[PDB]
Amino acid sequence: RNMQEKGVSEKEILEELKKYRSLDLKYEDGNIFGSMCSNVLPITRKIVDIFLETNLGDPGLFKGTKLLEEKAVALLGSLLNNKDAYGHIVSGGTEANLMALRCIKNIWREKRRKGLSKNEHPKIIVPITAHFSFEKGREMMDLEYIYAPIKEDYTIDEKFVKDAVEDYDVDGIIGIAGTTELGTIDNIEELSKIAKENNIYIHVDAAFGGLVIPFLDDKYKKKGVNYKFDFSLGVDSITIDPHAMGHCPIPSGGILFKDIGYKRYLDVQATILGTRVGFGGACTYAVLRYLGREGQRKIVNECMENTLYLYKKLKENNFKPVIEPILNIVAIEDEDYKEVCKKLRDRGIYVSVVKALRIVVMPHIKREHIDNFIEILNSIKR
């Protein structure tokens, strides 16, 4: 397509764009099974329109939108047991994780300048289940990762972390509250004890789980799983994303630090982006206020009901889930997962791909879609 001298009418360009949108899948149609995003809360469409022409890169021009970012951060902080959190509503969990990594690296830099570190690059303990944003950060910022192995329950091996912190000079620890692949929860309580006893920064990636775990009804909690992950454990920062299980429009990611003392280690404006949306903070604040805990609890446990329904139907049909679900994520063991995924795609079922098919039971996934999924999968298996 080449740039043209003459413009076209609104009707022409809107009809063209609608033809392309018709090629997309839509969350509400029973096709998308592998996404950690879903339909936005309908009220957010009005909020996006109100705040479209704001820019939190120049907050002096948009004092009210800036106050709403602060209020959104405060509500997330309150949810995470910290009324003094310092943070931002950023572009997503990637930027949030990258900012935590920047903070870790600048704490190390200060030590390095004072002769208080023998590491030529920050050394950070990262579980092998970490999201790919951590690899982007390693690659960009020249970080040294010590990859921590996982246990049979797919959570980080805390004894490895403890041993590594004794053997090596460590600049940071990462724990995950809701892994991307399986929805498992690292033992943040133990990791935070190790971190505190050794004066090591600890970041919790709760991009997905941060807006699920605090709302789980007791019947979905498992004996021997610890669900504690937030600032009550004294962690240094938490990633938590409204555009995942907060029903907010992209871009709405969250990064919270324990207090304002961390801001100075984000100096080079604290965000990676410059010009940036104002509607994310507005939507985050408004959705949490509109729903309250009661409304988010309802949505979370509706997803969990459908998750456990899917788990049951899978076993009934002789499929092997990787684990009993912890959050609203189920994975199905399959040796031919790559080909099965393509056969599912050919029949209108888009899962993600551990030698397993991964299903994220977001609010758009209803019982009828799970039944449909099981029928197609059964047929594929002959």
Ligand X SMILES: Cc1ncc(COP(=O)(O)O)c(CN[C@@H](Cc2ccc(O)cc2)C(=O)O)c1O
Q: Residue 257 or 279: which CB sits closer to a copy of itself?
A: 279
Q: Residue 117 or 357: which CB sits closer to ligand X?
A: 357
- String of contacts with ligand X for each residue 132-161, x by CB under 6 A: -x----------------------------
- String of contacts with ligand X for each residue 15-44, x by CB under 6 A: --------------------xxx-------
Question: Least distance from C-beta 272 to a copy of itself, angstroms?
Answer: 7
Question: Among residue numbers 235 through 274, which ones bind a copy of itself (CB under 8 A)?
Answer: 243, 249-251, 268-269, 272-274
- Other C-beta atoms closer than 10 Å to the C-beta of 318 total 8
**Segment near ligand X (CB under 6 A); pick from 73-81, 187-195, 204-212, 288-296:** 204-212
Can you tell me the distance from the alpha carbon of 376 to that of 382, in angstroms, rounded to the nearest whole number? 10
The answer to whether residues 96 and 253 touch, using CB atoms and an 8 Å cutoff, is yes
Q: By CB under 8 A, tell whether 51 contacts a copy of itself.
A: yes
Q: By CB under 6 A, tell whether 129 contacts ligand X.
A: no
- Other C-beta atoms closer than 10 Å to the C-beta of 96 total 30
The answer to whether residues 106 and 268 touch, using CB atoms and an 8 Å cutoff, is no
Question: Among residue numbers 315 through 354, which ones bind a copy of itself (CB under 8 A)?
Answer: 350
Q: By CB under 6 A, tell whether 198 contacts ligand X.
A: no
Can you tell me the distance from the alpha carbon of 254 to that of 251, in angstroms, rounded to the nearest whole number? 10
Phi, psi of 197 (to 5 degrees): -65, -25
Taking the CA atoms of residue 359, residue 365, residue 370 and residue 375 in that order, the dihedral angle to the nearest 10 degrees is -90
Q: Which of 88, 102, 123, 131 binds ligand X (CB under 6 A)?
A: 131
Question: Among residue numbers 141 through 170, which ones bind a copy of itself (CB under 8 A)?
Answer: 141-142
Can you tell me the distance from the alpha carbon of 214 to that of 228, in angstroms, rounded to the nearest whole number? 9
The answer to whether residues 238 and 207 touch, using CB atoms and an 8 Å cutoff, is no
3-state DSSP helix/strand/coil percent for the chain, to nearest 5? 45, 15, 40
Q: Residue 60 or 224: which CB sits closer to ligand X?
A: 60
Q: Residue 265 or 311: which CB sits closer to a copy of itself?
A: 265
Binder of residue 318, out of ligand X, a copy of itself, none (CB less than 5 to 8 A by kind): none
Question: Least distance from C-beta 324 to a copy of itself, angstroms?
Answer: 27
Q: By CB under 8 A, tell whether 218 contacts a copy of itself.
A: no
Collect all residues with Cβ–Cβ distance below 8 Å to 323 and sequence separation of at least 6. 153, 154, 182, 184, 331
Q: Which of 30, 87, 92, 127 binds a copy of itself (CB under 8 A)?
A: 92
Closest CA to 263 of 85, 80, 69: 85
Q: Which of 74, 353, 376, 380 binds a copy of itself (CB under 8 A)?
A: 74
Amino acid residing at 24:
D
Give the footprint of ligand X on this chain (CB under 6 A): 35-37, 55, 57-58, 61, 92-94, 97, 131, 133, 180, 205, 207-208, 241, 253, 274-275
